[PDB]
Amino acid sequence: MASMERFLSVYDEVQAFLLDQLQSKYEIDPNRARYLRIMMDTTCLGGKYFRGMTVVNVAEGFLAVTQHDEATKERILHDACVGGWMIEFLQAHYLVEDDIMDGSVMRRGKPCWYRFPGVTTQCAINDGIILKSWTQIMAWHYFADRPFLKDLLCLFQKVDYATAVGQMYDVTSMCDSNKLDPEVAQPMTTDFAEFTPAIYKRIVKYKTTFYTYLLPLVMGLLVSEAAASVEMNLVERVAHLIGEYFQVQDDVMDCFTPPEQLGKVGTDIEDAKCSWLAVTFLGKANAAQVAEFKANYGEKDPAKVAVVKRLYSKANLQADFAAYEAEVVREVESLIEQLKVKSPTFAESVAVVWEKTHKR
Amino acid sequence: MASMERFLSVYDEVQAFLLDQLQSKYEIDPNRARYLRIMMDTTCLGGKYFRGMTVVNVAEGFLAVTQHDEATKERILHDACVGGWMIEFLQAHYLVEDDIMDGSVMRRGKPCWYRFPGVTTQCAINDGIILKSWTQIMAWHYFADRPFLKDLLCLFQKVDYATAVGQMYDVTSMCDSNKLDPEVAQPMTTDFAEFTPAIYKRIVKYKTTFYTYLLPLVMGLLVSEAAASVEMNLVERVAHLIGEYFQVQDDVMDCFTPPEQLGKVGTDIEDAKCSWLAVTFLGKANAAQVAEFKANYGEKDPAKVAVVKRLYSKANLQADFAAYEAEVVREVESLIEQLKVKSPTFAESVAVVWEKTHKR
Ligand SMILES: CC(=O)Nc1ccccc1C(=O)NN
Ligand SMILES: CC(=O)Nc1ccccc1C(=O)NN
Ligand SMILES: [Zn+2]
Ligand SMILES: [Zn+2]
Ligand SMILES: [Zn+2]
Ligand SMILES: [Zn+2]
């Protein structure tokens, strides 16, 4: 069986399980099941499945070097697929809620879920809640007797919580820290003093890297009973590194990738986000460039947004991006080597994860 | 130590733990810790703690009839307090998200969290996410080596998921089921055919009873290692019963309790909710009363809202409420008796829970 065919098959299995359970146990009616089925499909399907398929790829790597009965290979692959779907549904939860929080319009060339006419914000907030709740149902059902259940649920919780804290760091990145106050409406920074590489790194570490890279790699190790083939501090190090690079690419595309190709209209400039471009720009700008940036950033006026894109465009940020890229290539290749001391297999999966990231 | 003093003390402990953890492990800064501290206080504190204190009361009941070392009594009481706070934070999550979903204004005489000037919807959605995430952190930290950890986390998940499904039943209660469709903007019912006692019961079972009554009673049993002193089917039966009664009281107050005493302006009529009053009214109305209700319900116009309150007011719904009340008294007293076959203690705690409900 090709990996993706298996993974998609398991989607249909898990869907059927969750919807059947809602009928036998939760008194649901056919029509509300249908709404939830459509919600699931709409929010979970249509991506590349990178996160979920990484769990499967990591487990296939170990299968090739470990002795097992055929039924045990099938159980491991089925558990890798379940776990990969947990991650995909977790991502779905955050995309639905983020889209609502950020007033987003489109995602992937289609309207955000909350914007569907028969959804609305009132239902979509709860739909997003349900998406994450289904991750737990999956785990307690498919993994009920498994040795790794405890470790997987603990890992998933820590990853979820890091991700929520990263959303907080992200949405507050354009405020001055010393002015955060629930009682007082929050003004945009005027000094941009908190637009630094270290602050940027913290936002991205927490908002994306844990769920996108750490969790799929560690989940693959757990369903394989292979956590002893790695040094976990190295797996954390390489996940945070590759994950940062991924987000830098995403920041640059928000600004410069045509909307029809990006799948949405990028608004990081108007939203005053602490993006890689803003930080890198401030890190090399002269005084008049910093002042022009300040007069124009975080405004909806398209003329000001164009002034920002022009400043970025003339500041030779491609050079800074290639220098960054070169350094990440260098460091990820060193970590991959440190990962061979214990597992060629796992180091190769990390290599594949890097290749898929680097060359998109 | 009085129970409430202990419970409040443990709040301060748990708060300190979560905020310290955010500093040592999650790279938080003092200012964002302070925002989260204020958020926690604002959303978790200020109620009666009924839910959390039930866990403590149930565990105190068992302590009085079970032999233990004093350190073991202290550990049980501390675990009951932690678990009670998990429930209180879970309720906080749902109140924050519900308030956003329903466009609520006030809760308990203060603005809803999302309406604070330095919060907004963008941050409050995520704050609510964090509230529930903190329930998990509590459990994995305080209960890490406890025998009941697995059973508690499984119970809490099922309760959370039931509650989300109940929010779905609630927010869609005024739509015709056969017209639910994410693609099509949802019209209000015109026939009210789905405003039935059985449909009402399903909404309330799921939206309130599991977290308000089932979970505190079962959590008390689990931290006490006492689940064998009960027949779980009876504990489910009595929790769903008392919980329904609680929600009927809440529905009647939304309509008839003065705003300054209710702590908010009740809008169930304007929101077209499937309330006890609407259902009970339709269950006795003549044809002209049903038609007047239909012409007036689910509208913001205060004159129409007054027409609805007038219809309810002339339909002798107090009689139906006393008849309901009498039947619930009767049935809960029968269940309490069935609960003595195994535990006087637990049956008394259920009695107290009922007294606190019935006489508010
Ligand atoms: C078209 C494109 O992909 N990028 C740019 C265009 C204009 C200015 C800067 C960049 C850039 O990448 N900066 N790092
Ligand atoms: C003042 C009050 O608490 N209740 C009513 C007032 C007017 C009409 C009906 C009721 C009622 O309770 N119905 N069950
Ligand atoms: Zn966002
Ligand atoms: Zn982006
Ligand atoms: Zn609501
Ligand atoms: Zn109410």
Side-chain angles (χ1 to χ4, degrees):
Chain A
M1 198 166 193
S3 294
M4 179 63 70
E5 290 159 29
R6 190 189 293 271
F7 190 69
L8 299 177
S9 300
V10 169
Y11 177 89
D12 288 344
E13 183 191 342
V14 171
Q15 173 175 97
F17 168 82
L18 293 169
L19 294 175
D20 290 4
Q21 181 181 258
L22 280 154
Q23 183 216 78
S24 70
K25 291 206 189 359
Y26 292 89
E27 300 170 33
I28 205 169
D29 59 283
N31 282 292
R32 281 179 182 72
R34 170 171 55 75
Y35 177 99
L36 290 169
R37 187 167 58 60
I38 295 166
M39 189 272 282
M40 195 189 304
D41 290 353
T42 310
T43 62
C44 293
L45 304 172
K48 280 175 274 142
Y49 312 118
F50 164 81
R51 298 166 183 73
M53 283 299 296
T54 296
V55 184
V56 175
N57 292 335
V58 163
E60 294 170 324
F62 287 101
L63 290 177
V65 299
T66 311
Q67 295 176 334
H68 296 297
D69 276 352
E70 188 63 25
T72 297
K73 295 173 208 209
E74 287 296 318
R75 177 197 93 215
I76 290 172
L77 287 171
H78 192 277
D79 282 355
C81 289
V82 173
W85 284 112
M86 291 175 63
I87 307 177
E88 289 296 322
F89 277 53
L90 182 67
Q91 170 170 62
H93 159 80
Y94 280 111
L95 306 178
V96 164
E97 304 294 0
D98 194 54
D99 285 344
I100 294 159
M101 285 185 297
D102 299 348
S104 304
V105 185
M106 308 267 276
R107 189 168 274 280
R108 274 206 236 87
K110 271 163 56 180
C112 302
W113 180 246
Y114 77 101
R115 296 189 56 261
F116 274 53
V119 177
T120 81
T121 301
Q122 179 168 54
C123 285
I125 297 169
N126 197 65
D127 294 341
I129 287 170
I130 290 170
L131 284 159
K132 192 161 72 193
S133 193
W134 278 335
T135 71
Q136 308 302 288
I137 299 298
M138 290 177 219
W140 283 98
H141 177 72
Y142 292 102
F143 306 150
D145 64 30
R146 296 285 191 277
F148 56 75
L149 180 56
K150 183 178 187 174
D151 285 345
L152 187 155
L153 293 167
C154 178
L155 169 66
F156 198 88
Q157 154 63 25
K158 280 183 190 157
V159 163
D160 179 38
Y161 184 56
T163 304
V165 174
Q167 168 72 355
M168 187 193 185
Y169 290 156
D170 198 46
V171 302
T172 63
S173 63
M174 70 295 300
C175 295
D176 289 346
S177 301
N178 65 310
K179 297 274 232 62
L180 288 170
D181 181 353
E183 293 297 317
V184 173
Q186 292 289 296
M188 181 168 41
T189 193
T190 55
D191 66 12
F192 295 88
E194 292 178 65
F195 275 43
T196 69
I199 289 170
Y200 178 83
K201 284 169 198 166
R202 181 184 70 167
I203 288 166
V204 172
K205 178 178 158 166
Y206 287 91
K207 82 153 159 184
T208 319
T209 72
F210 282 90
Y211 85 92
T212 302
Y213 294 93
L214 187 57
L215 184 60
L217 291 168
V218 184
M219 204 181 280
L221 292 166
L222 292 176
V223 303
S224 299
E225 299 285 343
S229 314
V230 311
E231 193 70 59
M232 194 60 62
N233 283 341
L234 290 175
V235 177
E236 289 180 23
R237 284 162 59 201
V238 78
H240 294 318
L241 183 67
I242 300 170
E244 189 184 296
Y245 183 84
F246 170 72
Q247 185 62 61
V248 171
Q249 291 174 306
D250 183 294
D251 287 1
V252 165
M253 292 167 31
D254 193 272
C255 192
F256 293 119
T257 300
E260 103 271 324
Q261 180 171 343
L262 193 56
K264 54 175 200 176
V265 173
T267 57
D268 285 358
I269 292 170
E270 294 93 324
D271 297 336
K273 304 307 295 296
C274 180
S275 70
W276 178 83
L277 288 166
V279 169
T280 301
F281 177 84
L282 294 170
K284 77 189 304 191
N286 62 29
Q289 290 172 305
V290 171
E292 195 172 15
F293 169 97
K294 292 181 175 166
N296 283 287
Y297 200 67
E299 302 281 327
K300 254 112 222 320
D301 179 352
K304 294 188 172 163
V305 171
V307 168
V308 178
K309 294 204 185 182
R310 206 77 58 109
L311 287 173
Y312 286 172
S313 297
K314 294 197 220 92
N316 197 202
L317 288 171
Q318 294 85 343
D320 299 267
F321 176 79
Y324 172 74
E325 182 177 18
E327 184 58 24
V328 177
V329 174
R330 176 174 161 89
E331 291 179 302
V332 175
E333 294 191 342
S334 171
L335 288 164
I336 288 170
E337 296 287 299
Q338 294 284 9
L339 287 167
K340 292 162 165 167
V341 172
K342 295 182 169 202
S343 181
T345 297
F346 183 71
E348 176 55 18
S349 295
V350 176
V352 171
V353 160
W354 171 243
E355 291 171 12
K356 281 148 159 215
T357 303
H358 188 219
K359 56 91 268 156
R360 86 201 185 96
Chain B
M1 198 166 193
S3 294
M4 179 63 70
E5 290 159 29
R6 190 189 293 271
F7 190 69
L8 299 177
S9 300
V10 169
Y11 177 89
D12 288 344
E13 183 191 342
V14 171
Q15 173 175 97
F17 168 82
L18 293 169
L19 294 175
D20 290 4
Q21 181 181 258
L22 280 154
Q23 183 216 78
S24 70
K25 291 206 189 359
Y26 292 89
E27 300 170 33
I28 205 169
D29 59 283
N31 282 292
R32 281 179 182 72
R34 170 171 55 75
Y35 177 99
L36 290 169
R37 187 167 58 60
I38 295 166
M39 189 272 282
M40 195 189 304
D41 290 353
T42 310
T43 62
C44 293
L45 304 172
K48 280 175 274 142
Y49 312 118
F50 164 81
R51 298 166 183 73
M53 283 299 296
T54 296
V55 184
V56 175
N57 292 335
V58 163
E60 294 170 324
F62 287 101
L63 290 177
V65 299
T66 311
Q67 295 176 334
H68 296 297
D69 276 352
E70 188 63 25
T72 297
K73 294 173 208 209
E74 287 296 318
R75 177 197 93 215
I76 290 172
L77 287 171
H78 192 277
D79 282 355
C81 289
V82 173
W85 284 112
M86 291 175 63
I87 307 177
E88 289 296 322
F89 277 53
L90 182 67
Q91 170 170 62
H93 159 80
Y94 280 111
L95 306 178
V96 164
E97 304 294 0
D98 194 54
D99 285 344
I100 294 159
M101 285 185 297
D102 299 348
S104 304
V105 185
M106 308 267 276
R107 189 168 274 280
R108 274 206 236 87
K110 271 163 56 180
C112 302
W113 180 246
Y114 77 101
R115 296 189 56 261
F116 274 53
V119 177
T120 81
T121 301
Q122 179 168 54
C123 285
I125 297 169
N126 197 65
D127 294 341
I129 287 170
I130 290 170
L131 284 159
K132 192 161 72 193
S133 193
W134 278 335
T135 71
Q136 308 302 288
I137 299 298
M138 290 177 219
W140 283 98
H141 177 72
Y142 292 102
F143 306 150
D145 64 30
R146 296 285 191 277
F148 56 75
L149 180 56
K150 183 178 187 174
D151 285 345
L152 187 155
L153 293 167
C154 178
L155 169 66
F156 198 88
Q157 154 63 25
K158 281 183 190 157
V159 163
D160 179 38
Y161 184 56
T163 304
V165 174
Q167 168 72 355
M168 187 193 185
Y169 290 156
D170 198 46
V171 302
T172 63
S173 63
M174 70 295 300
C175 295
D176 289 346
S177 301
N178 65 310
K179 297 274 232 62
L180 288 170
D181 181 353
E183 293 297 317
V184 173
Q186 292 289 296
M188 181 168 41
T189 193
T190 55
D191 66 12
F192 295 88
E194 292 178 65
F195 275 43
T196 69
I199 289 170
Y200 178 83
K201 284 169 198 166
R202 181 184 70 167
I203 288 166
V204 172
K205 178 178 158 166
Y206 287 91
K207 82 153 159 184
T208 319
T209 72
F210 282 90
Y211 85 92
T212 302
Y213 294 93
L214 187 57
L215 184 60
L217 291 168
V218 184
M219 204 181 280
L221 292 166
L222 292 176
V223 303
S224 299
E225 299 285 343
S229 314
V230 311
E231 193 70 59
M232 194 60 62
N233 283 341
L234 290 175
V235 177
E236 289 180 23
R237 284 162 59 201
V238 78
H240 294 318
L241 183 67
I242 300 170
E244 189 184 296
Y245 183 84
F246 170 72
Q247 185 62 61
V248 171
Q249 291 174 306
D250 183 294
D251 287 1
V252 165
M253 292 167 31
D254 193 272
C255 192
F256 293 119
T257 300
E260 103 271 324
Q261 180 171 343
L262 193 56
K264 54 175 200 176
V265 173
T267 57
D268 285 358
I269 292 170
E270 294 93 324
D271 297 336
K273 304 307 295 296
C274 180
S275 70
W276 178 83
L277 288 166
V279 169
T280 301
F281 177 84
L282 294 170
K284 77 189 304 191
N286 62 29
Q289 290 172 305
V290 171
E292 195 173 15
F293 169 97
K294 292 181 175 166
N296 283 287
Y297 200 67
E299 302 281 327
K300 254 112 222 320
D301 179 352
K304 294 188 172 163
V305 171
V307 168
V308 178
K309 294 204 185 182
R310 206 77 58 109
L311 287 173
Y312 286 172
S313 297
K314 294 197 220 92
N316 197 202
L317 288 171
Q318 294 85 343
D320 299 267
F321 176 79
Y324 172 74
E325 182 177 18
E327 184 58 24
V328 177
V329 174
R330 176 174 161 89
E331 291 179 302
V332 175
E333 294 191 342
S334 171
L335 288 164
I336 288 170
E337 296 287 299
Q338 294 284 9
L339 287 167
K340 292 162 165 167
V341 172
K342 295 182 169 202
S343 181
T345 297
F346 183 71
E348 176 55 18
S349 295
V350 176
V352 171
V353 160
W354 171 243
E355 291 171 12
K356 281 148 159 215
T357 303
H358 188 219
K359 56 91 268 156
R360 86 201 185 96

